[PDB]
């Protein structure tokens, strides 16, 4: 099992490392690549950490040692012609190292990068559409700390589908289907918008100086432990990510997916959905399409 | 418990305070302070994570509303020795005012020095308390567990070294002869010896600019947070080594494994037979562990 980051360096990266370090299972591999010069030493820095999780770091302009026989492909690097360009120029070497890699993209804008990521793949002949992520999983774990908080419940017991893509009012919290939980219409109208905007309140209070960082290196961790607990054989690990599927909403569409030994086992079906969730997913249809064809055409 | 970590927006702040807030207690809470303008939200940050830890974040000059109510600080603060022996001591004022009676962990360099300038500033505020002032060493600890796991075959998390002296070169005195089920050849002592001593050198090496540990202290300081937690929630057992002002038998501040509870050290425990490597290492140190301390307290006074 060998988990390589790209973008390692980075504040998301480092996070990301940090957790994976402490968190793989037992006689993992960890490899963190960065342009920037200081990589190999962030990796050093956690090799310090007396867990069996073997870690080296690289940095230059290419990924190989990195990314050779990894399991899974996290890719936080990173407007958006520069992040568009930096996704393609990361998947390329994905495609020619890893090809059979599971690949998890962070780099933002999500809805449109994975899109890039699909068409690179696809132009070098080894597109798995069960092996390709967008991660969405911090609008996931930001909606469960917000619920919980509402409720008065445990925080980790609250798990909260969130559907749709990952930006604006294409995310799709299914507020409805959180067991033993239930709001008003007003309170899933505003509790929506909360979750749509959720990272302007980290902008805002890091003073316009930055970005949201640490919740998203622990949302990257829980959903790359997640693939390696399924690539391992372990059942039952279930995940909302934005995947290719089956076409019914949009070319590529968040779901809860069933993971296992070759990425999606099942895509699995969002469910009964309330007037507001019906409402608000046939609204968004129209914005999530145009977010794809912006990353097939970044690509041509 | 609440947990305020002074320094936070910094390389090793951010790390630690990632892992307080998805490793402490359920009911705990976390206060971040740093002059750094972004430090409110890097708590708003953390805030959305679903863990039952409540996190706020504080900047300006003022560390009060942090400190308020604190059970366990922690300082990695700093910008050079004397700006940052400038900054622990304007920080442990802020403490011995709003906080006295939590336990302190000091992470700023250089420990051997910046623990005695706390415990000055303590006792001109007439708060100090011997048993919760700590320089924090733990990186010592888990650096030499992970070499000598490496080395001699075993799981890296079943393996735990005594770690004693301070926190600098030749005053880190890892005690191999003391490893349980693990023996090792003079020649092995030597290497891991070196290595250890020098490990924070390797690190600035390897970062080829980019400076210091930053992730690995932050796991170093959470558990030695996390330890200190357990301890004054009640919790049996727990050991770690830290540099205290203990007995003076080998210099007034020393680093020796503390049997921690509900009021900071409970008991301070014998380094215990020491190898003729380890004595003649003792021995070789404390000059210049003495005069790390002196500098401290005549920072203060
Ligand atoms: N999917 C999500 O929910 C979120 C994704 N985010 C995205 O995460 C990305 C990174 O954000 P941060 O970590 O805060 O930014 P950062 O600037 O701290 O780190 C980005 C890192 O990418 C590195 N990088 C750039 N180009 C390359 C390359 N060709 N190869 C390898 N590494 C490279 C760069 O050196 C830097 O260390 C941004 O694109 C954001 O769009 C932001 C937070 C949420
Ligand atoms: N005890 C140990 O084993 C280790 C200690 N280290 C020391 O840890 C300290 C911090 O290192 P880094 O995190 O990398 O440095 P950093 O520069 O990334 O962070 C320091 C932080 O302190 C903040 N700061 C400065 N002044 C104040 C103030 N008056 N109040 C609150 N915050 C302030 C500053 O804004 C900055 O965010 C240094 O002295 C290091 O030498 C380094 C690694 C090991």
Redesign the interface.
């Known amino acids: 099992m060998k988990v390589a980051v790209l973008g390692a360096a980075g504040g998301i990266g480092?996070?990301l490392?940090?957790?994976l370090?402490?968190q793989l299972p037992?006689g993992s591999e960890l490899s963190l690549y960065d342009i920037a010069?200081?990589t190999?030493?962030?990796?050093?820095?956690?090799?310090?950490?007396?867990?069996?999780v073997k870690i080296k770091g690289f940095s230059g302009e290419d990924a190989t040692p990195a990314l050779e026989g990894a399991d899974v492909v996290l890719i936080s690097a990173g407007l958006f012609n520069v992040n568009a360009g930096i996704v393609k120029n990361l998947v390329q070497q994905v495609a020619k190292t890893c090809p059979k890699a599971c690949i998890g993209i962070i780099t933002n804008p999500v809805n449109t990068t994975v899109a890039i990521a699909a068409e690179v793949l696809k132009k070098a002949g080894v597109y798995d559409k069960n092996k390709l992520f967008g991660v969405t999983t911090?609008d996931i774990?930001?909606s469960?700390?917000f619920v919980?908080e509402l409720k008065g419940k445990?925080?980790?017991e609250?798990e909260v589908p969130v559907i749709g893509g990952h930006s604006g009012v294409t995310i799709l919290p299914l507020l409805s289907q959180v067991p033993g939980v239930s709001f008003t219409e007003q309170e899933v109208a505003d509790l929506t918008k909360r979750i749509q905007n959720?990272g302007t309140?980290?902008?805002?209070?890091?003073?316009g100086?930055?970005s949201?960082?640490?919740?998203m290196?622990?949302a990257a961790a829980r959903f790359g432990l997640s693939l390696v607990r399924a690539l391992q054989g372990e059942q039952g690990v279930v995940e909302c990510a934005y995947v290719e599927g089956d076409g019914q909403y949009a070319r590529f569409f968040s779901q809860p997916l069933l993971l296992g030994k070759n990425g999606v086992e099942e895509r699995k079906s969002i469910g009964t959905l309330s007037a507001f969730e019906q409402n608000a997913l046939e609204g968004m249809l129209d914005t999530l399409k145009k977010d794809i064809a912006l990353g097939e055409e970044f690509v041509n």
């Open positions: 480092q996070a490392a940090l957790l370090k402490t037992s010069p200081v190999p030493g962030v990796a050093v820095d956690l090799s310090h950490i007396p867990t069996a911090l774990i930001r469960n700390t919980a445990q925080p980790g609250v959720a309140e980290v902008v805002e209070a890091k003073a100086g930055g949201a960082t640490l919740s290196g622990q």
